[PDB]
């Protein structure tokens, strides 16, 4: 634990990036979290929503 101060900064940056990439897997109330699935499955009037 000698170099903990640098390791905390590295871990916080990597964890923030990891959470940012994890946010892509959430649909946020939509039918799916994948854009390609929505583009392939729906007409534009529902796809815009």
């Amino acid at each position: 634990s000698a170099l903990g101060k640098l390791q905390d900064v590295v871990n916080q940056n990597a964890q923030a990036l990891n959470t940012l990439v994890k946010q892509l897997s959430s649909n946020f109330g939509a039918i799916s979290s994948v854009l390609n699935d929505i583009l392939s499955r729906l007409d534009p009037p529902e796809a815009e929503v």
């Binding site: 039918i31 392939s40 499955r41 729906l42 007409d43």
Partner: protein
């Protein structure tokens, strides 16, 4: 069958042409919810039930 004993048929291991369902005018209501009607020929499915 009647609506209390509605008949459920599994559809699997087939290639399905849904374009004869869209282009047929015999259906009074042809309404899809989770999928576009014109994209049915472009997608692959499982757990198909009629």
């Amino acid at each position: 069958a009647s609506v209390y004993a509605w008949n459920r048929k599994r559809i699997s291991n087939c290639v399905a042409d849904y374009s004869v369902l869209y282009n047929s005018a015999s259906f009074s209501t042809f309404k899809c919810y989770g999928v576009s009607p014109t994209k049915l020929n472009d997608l692959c499915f499982t757990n198909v039930y009629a």
